[PDB]
Paper text:
[name]-[name]-2 main protease (Mpro) is one of two cysteine proteases necessary for viral replication and assembly, with analogous functional counterparts in earlier [name]-[name]-1 and Middle Eastern Respiratory Syndrome (MERS) coronavirus variants. Mpro cleavage of pp1a and pp1ab at the 11 sites, including autoprocessing sites at its own N- and C-termini, releases nonstructural proteins (nsp) 4–16.
For both structures, the asymmetric unit is composed of an Mpro dimer with crystal packing orienting the C-terminus of one monomer (chain B′) proximal to the active site of a symmetry-related monomer (chain B). Capture of a well-ordered product complex in the catalytically impaired [name]-[name]-2 Mpro [name] mutant is clearly defined in the electron density maps. Well-ordered electron density unambiguously confirms the alanine mutation and presence of terminating main chain carboxylate oxygens. The second carboxylate oxygen is positioned to form a strong inline hydrogen bond interaction with His41 Nε2 (2.9 Å), again supporting a role of the latter in general base activation of a nucleophilic water to form such a product.
Residue numbers in the entry:
A (entry chain B), B (entry chain A): 1 to 306
Amino acid sequence: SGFRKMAFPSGKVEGCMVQVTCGTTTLNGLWLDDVVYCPRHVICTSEDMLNPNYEDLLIRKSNHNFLVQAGNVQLRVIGHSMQNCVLKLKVDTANPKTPKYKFVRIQPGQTFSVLACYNGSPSGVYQCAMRPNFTIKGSFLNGSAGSVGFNIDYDCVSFCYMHHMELPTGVHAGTDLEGNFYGPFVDRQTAQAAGTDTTITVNVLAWLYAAVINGDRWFLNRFTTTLNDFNLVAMKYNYEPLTQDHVDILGPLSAQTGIAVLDMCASLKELLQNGMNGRTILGSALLEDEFTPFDVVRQCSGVTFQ
Amino acid sequence: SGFRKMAFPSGKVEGCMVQVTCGTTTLNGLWLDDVVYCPRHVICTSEDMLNPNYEDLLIRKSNHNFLVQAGNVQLRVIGHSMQNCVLKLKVDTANPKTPKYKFVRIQPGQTFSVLACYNGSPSGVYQCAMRPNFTIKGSFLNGSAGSVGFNIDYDCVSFCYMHHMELPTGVHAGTDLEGNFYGPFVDRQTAQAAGTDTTITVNVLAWLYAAVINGDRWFLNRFTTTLNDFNLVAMKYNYEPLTQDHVDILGPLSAQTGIAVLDMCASLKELLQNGMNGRTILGSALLEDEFTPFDVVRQCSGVTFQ
């Protein structure tokens, strides 16, 4: 028993972290097979960030300008190319520690683990959610770019995020492993602002099901609702709309607990309109939106009577 | 910027997890050098589990009764002995993945990362605190016994916890790596109950310093306080008394932020008496006590590990 924000074991990803240096700029790279992936702003100086012409800066650099280090070993760069906002450095050696992996682009609301790194070395691991405004509420300092977000499926590592930068509100922006930013952000020093952040409704519902499994049922009511009706109320409280794919995803929890998804939507609707009145849910005064239905399922391990 | 419950990278510990089977009982073991450490209740059956005579059960078992597996490889057990509540199985092979390690006994208030395992395989990693009542508020299911807790400093893994069981309130009990339980608990099915839990004051102060570093400063006040005056208020809110050793421990953060410890104590005193009035600290409506002063330094300075 017990629920916790759990990250995946980081071992498979730690064996892929390298340090990439270009001039005086150092950040983290990801060594998979004979390729090192890293943010393209490694080729920039502080002055270049004001409006960098990346094609032009890359053209002026050669393989010898990249210093890739994997511990006390230098990796010889054989080729280099840019794919969107990521730099790919072909090295002469294939990483012997390369796990089974794939690159995936995640949707807002989905979670992943972050292995925060500095100088090619891991500092810590934590669980994050991709926000509806395409930012992440992470913990990153200068030198953390190149750090990746991932999930593990059996023994396959799915890389879904590479860190690039921090927005003025203290949230983080990055790309998938194909170099494409999540959201409307650019790797240029300009005034950028994240859109209005919204609550991940499907995860609040999953968390209300976790509370029901753990014995917290004060918020439950004998009422039901209709999908569009709920979405109109939720929209007013800055909650994301609940799609039919979200309802399908909540199916296993709904079946186990015997509480239909739309009955839980009516309980959430009452909570939004009346508040919690000093009461808590799972030892929390606020509704949690970074705990997915999958986490609730795998941590409960309950049976579904039919 | 940002502040998260951050676990240590688990890679070094993943290379030490093995599966230990004795009869029909299977749990996790810790393979360091030529020794496998695991809870002694692996030698028990469901019937033994009420009031087991461990000495007698161990006496009636031989090395051939233990099946130790490290992936698709069986490890030969050469010897076996009991040290308090842990079984030590000497194997014929030294773990080639043994990191630099030491066994430590931690104090209440201290945090560590838990690598939750099932059948010798890591499932997830999270950060825990040893509560003042010697329980941990973890996330464990049947088969998680033998999962360990650890901290890292420089390149040395300090193992401080091995999981054994769950108490009737849903909290968890375990031992240090010398087999001694944290708290007044025993490894059998008897009436056991955790004592009254309290808030780890020195950790709440460490977390208020983390908030200040991240620019969340609304709670700061012009008032200062005396130590006994603070303890007289904190005691009423079920907070642990702040000792002079705690003030000394908060010294580096106090110097790093320019805010005296007793100045922060007066801010906490106001927060306890008036509440947060709808405001949050580091996105939290409740005061967090599972970050020590070094957990804050480690994260906000970007300390990395081997």
